[PDB]
Amino acid sequence: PTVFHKRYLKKIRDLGEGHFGKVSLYCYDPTNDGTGEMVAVKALKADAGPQHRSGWKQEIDILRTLYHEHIIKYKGCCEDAGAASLQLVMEYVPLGSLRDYLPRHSIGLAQLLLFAQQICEGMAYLHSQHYIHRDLAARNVLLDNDRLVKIGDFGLAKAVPEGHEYYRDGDSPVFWYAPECLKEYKFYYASDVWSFGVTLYELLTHCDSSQSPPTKFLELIGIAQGQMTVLRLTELLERGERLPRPDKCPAEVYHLMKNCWETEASFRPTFENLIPILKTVHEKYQG
Numbered sequence: 001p002t003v004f005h006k007r008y009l010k011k012i013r014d015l016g017e018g019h020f021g022k023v024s025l026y027c028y029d030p031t032n033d034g035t036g037e038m039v040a041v042k043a044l045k046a047d048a049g050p051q052h053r054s055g056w057k058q059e060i061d062i063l064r065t066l067y068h069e070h071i072i073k074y075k076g077c078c079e080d081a082g083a084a085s086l087q088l089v090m091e092y093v094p095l096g097s098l099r100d101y102l103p104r105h106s107i108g109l110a111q112l113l114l115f116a117q118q119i120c121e122g123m124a125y126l127h128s129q130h131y132i133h134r135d136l137a138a139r140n141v142l143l144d145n146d147r148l149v150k151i152g153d154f155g156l157a158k159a160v161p162e163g164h165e166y167y168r169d170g171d172s173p174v175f176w177y178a179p180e181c182l183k184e185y186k187f188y189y190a191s192d193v194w195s196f197g198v199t200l201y202e203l204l205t206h207c208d209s210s211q212s213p214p215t216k217f218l219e220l221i222g223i224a225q226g227q228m229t230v231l232r233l234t235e236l237l238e239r240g241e242r243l244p245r246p247d248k249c250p251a252e253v254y255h256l257m258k259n260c261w262e263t264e265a266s267f268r269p270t271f272e273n274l275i276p277i278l279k280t281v282h283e284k285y286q287g
């Protein structure tokens with residue numbers, strides 16, 4: 001409901017960009033004194049078509065109703081006159097994504113497992129509101145402080161239809177996708193759990209680019225495959241091939257990743273089942 005007046009918005013820097021959206025940091029200072037607030041503002045590119053434009057209004061709606069400690073805070077909206085839509089105004093998460101943070105700060109196993117647990121809490125909450133994330137990766141997990149992580153983007157999030165268990169593109173994050181998404185084109189709550197396992201893998205590799213899911217999966221498929229990357233990915237996953245065990249990852253946590261990566265979606269734990277398990281594995285490594 002909150003409206004941001006564009007007259008007090010001074011752009012500081014870019015925070016991220018996708019194929020149709022962009023996030024920039026702004027100072028919102030209705031003075032010029034030291035009462036100024038730091039905000040993250042998401043805008044839809046003015047060139048985006050009607051499908052992306054209607055999906056944008058849906059994204060804004062989803063964030064307006066989502067309230068959880070491990071989910072980015074919605075701040076307000078403002079008229080984006082140049083793009084002839086709205087701009088999504090959110091809180092500025094000071095330490096950025098884990099994708100950018102982890103390659104530069106050696107973090108202990110216990111802190112990573114705590115982050116893992118916080119992602120699950122945020123995701124179980126999202127699933128209880130009947131939404132699927134569709135884009136759970138370390139790039140969408142924002143660090144507030146060394147003990148607080150938040151799901152910071154909902155660009156692909158969809159409401160699961162009332163009498164259905166699932167929701168039915170070159171921008172799709174295929175290297176974080178369960179075989180049922182790639183093959184049957186169906187996204188279940190269990191499909192987000194697969195993606196979590198990929199995000200947990202990223203955390204345990206400290207988001208090293210040479211260990212990343214696209215790097216690792218493209219080394220297994222090869223690069224001279226024509227339009228067959230997705231087809232070849234679907235078949236290595238069906239032969240039980242998986243992302244390796246990250247160096248310094250305990251066997252137990254790796255088994256847990258493998259359980260999120262069950263080919264049979266029904267054999268995957270829910271995010272509710274993951275919470276007490278992660279609490280327990282974290283308490284262990286914290287001491």
Ligand SMILES: O=C(N[C@@]12C[C@@H]1CN(c1nc(Nc3cnn(CCO)c3)ncc1F)C2)C1CC1
Pocket residue numbers: 014015016017018021022023040072090091092093094095096097100101139140141142152153
């Ligand atoms: O950029 C996008 N989505 C989000 C998840 C990305 C980063 N974003 C946000 N980032 C931050 N803080 C911060 C600090 N540093 N850095 C850059 C290093 O990571 C980002 N706060 C709020 C946000 F909303 C939103 C969509 C493709 C356009």
